[PDB]
Write a protein that binds this DNA or RNA. Structure first.
Ligand SMILES: [Mg+2]
Ligand SMILES: [Mg+2]
Ligand SMILES: [Mg+2]
Ligand SMILES: [Mg+2]
Ligand SMILES: [Mg+2]
Ligand SMILES: [Mg+2]
Ligand SMILES: [Mg+2]
Ligand SMILES: [Mg+2]
Ligand SMILES: [Mg+2]
Lengths: 109, 62, 175
RNA sequence: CUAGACCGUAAGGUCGGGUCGAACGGCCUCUAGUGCAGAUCUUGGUGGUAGUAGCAAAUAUUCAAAUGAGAACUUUGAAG
């Protein structure tokens, strides 16, 4: 299919961080997002925008949001590439509410 | 690069703590070439090194 | 030169060494024994899969109180590990011996690890501090590693008078 | 060094082969700091234990870039 594609996802961080230790809720949220992007785009290489990291840690280490709207852009690895030819780039989506949104495909052009 | 010395110099020159010294991440090489307090002063002047204003302790609730 | 016992043709062999290597001797012995006798490219692919935890190094001698894994299944074992530091050192020597082999003119596709040997290098000494003002040794167990890659290559009977006569008798009553 | 050989009940002696590099034996006598398994023996070296016990107090780290062969840990920025 189209190796380079970008989509809109909402991730239920509530169930993924359910029961997780308080001091590692936000670091676990980072790892769950990387796992999420790996599952959806099939890329081992996942890179999170610092503004997405800021979104994760907005309410501190213990107060990750239940749902988070993400824009995942699978692209072509360049600049003296690593092993993989493709990588996923995750950046946050500014929405007043991250609820009641479906996975959609973003047109680059 | 290692800018640990430049940030300490910038704190001394500007007169703030190291916690208040902002070094431009896009000017790492130019900062690295600044090894003297005179060079730090010129970098503060042209804005490569910025004073990074105080976080406010508001009294309005008090 | 002067390796351990080898029984191969030096003309179609190449070799590599690393001495005094700061890497666990027990782990490196197991890693070496895991690729002993394998074809060279099969072992290098396998070592890459060990690095990313898809396949394991079976631990057969130095394994008391190791954990258990399903990745030991293919080797008939339950105790297997992923010694990344040993694997890096071995695959570094595999690369060198390969470089030596096609420097000598050897063919790549017929190369197999004919000899791989790990020996204890001299220990590097540190100290660890114990209860009641006691000091104990805190030692590294370094490794000497050597390996050779080789191209895969493709009574008079004494009879008594009775025995001779019986043979003659069988010949005159058989045809 | 040598599950190669021979002599002696034995302490031992001799020979072959490998390694090695500068001295050393047989016999008659003289002399002793003259023979080790032990001494919680002395000094030094080395194991099993064992890749084991563990590396858990001081609330806590995270994203990206830069550097570099290599970055959980270096630097810078962002954030907590
Ligand atoms: Mg629970
Ligand atoms: Mg245990
Ligand atoms: Mg201690
Ligand atoms: Mg013997
Ligand atoms: Mg000499
Ligand atoms: Mg004596
Ligand atoms: Mg003794
Ligand atoms: Mg005795
Ligand atoms: Mg342990």
């Amino acid at each position: 299919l189209k190796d380079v594609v970008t989509r809109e996802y909402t991730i239920n961080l509530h169930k993924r961080l359910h029961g997780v230790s308080f001091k590692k809720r936000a670091p676990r949220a980072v790892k769950e997002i990387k796992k999420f992007a790996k599952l959806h785009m099939g890329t081992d290489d996942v890179r999170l925008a610092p503004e997405l990291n800021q979104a994760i840690w907005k309410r501190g280490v213990k107060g990750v949001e239940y749902r988070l709207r993400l824009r995942i852009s699978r692209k072509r690895n360049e600049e003296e590439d690593a092993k993989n030819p493709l990588f996923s780039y995750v950046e946050p989506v500014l929405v007043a509410s991250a609820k009641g949104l479906q996975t959609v495909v973003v047109e680059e052009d | 690069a290692n800018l640990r010395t430049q940030k300490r110099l910038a704190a001394s020159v500007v007169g703030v703590g190291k916690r208040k010294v902002w070094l431009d991440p896009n000017e790492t090489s130019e900062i690295a070439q600044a090894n003297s307090r005179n060079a730090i002063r010129k970098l503060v002047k042209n804005g490569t090194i910025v004073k990074k204003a105080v976080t406010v302790h508001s009294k309005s609730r008090t | 030169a002067r390796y351990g016992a080898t029984s191969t043709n030096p003309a179609k062999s190449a070799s590599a060494r690393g001495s005094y290597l700061r890497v666990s001797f027990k782990n490196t012995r197991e890693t070496a024994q895991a690729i002993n006798g394998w074809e060279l490219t099969k072992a290098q692919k396998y070592l890459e899969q060990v690095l990313d935890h898809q396949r394991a190094i079976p631990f057969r001698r130095f394994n008391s109180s190791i954990g258990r894994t399903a990745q030991g299944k293919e080797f008939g074992v339950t105790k297997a590990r992923w010694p990344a530091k040993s694997v890096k050192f071995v695959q570094g020597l595999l690369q060198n011996a390969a470089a030596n082999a096609e420097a000598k003119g050897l063919d790549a596709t017929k190369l197999y690890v004919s000899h791989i040997q790990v020996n204890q290098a001299p220990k590097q000494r540190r100290r660890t501090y114990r209860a009641h003002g006691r000091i104990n040794k805190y030692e590294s167990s370094p490794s000497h590693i050597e390996l050779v890659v080789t191209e895969k290559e493709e009574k008079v009977v004494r009879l008594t008078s009775r025995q001779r006569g019986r043979i003659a008798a069988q010949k005159r009553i058989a045809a």
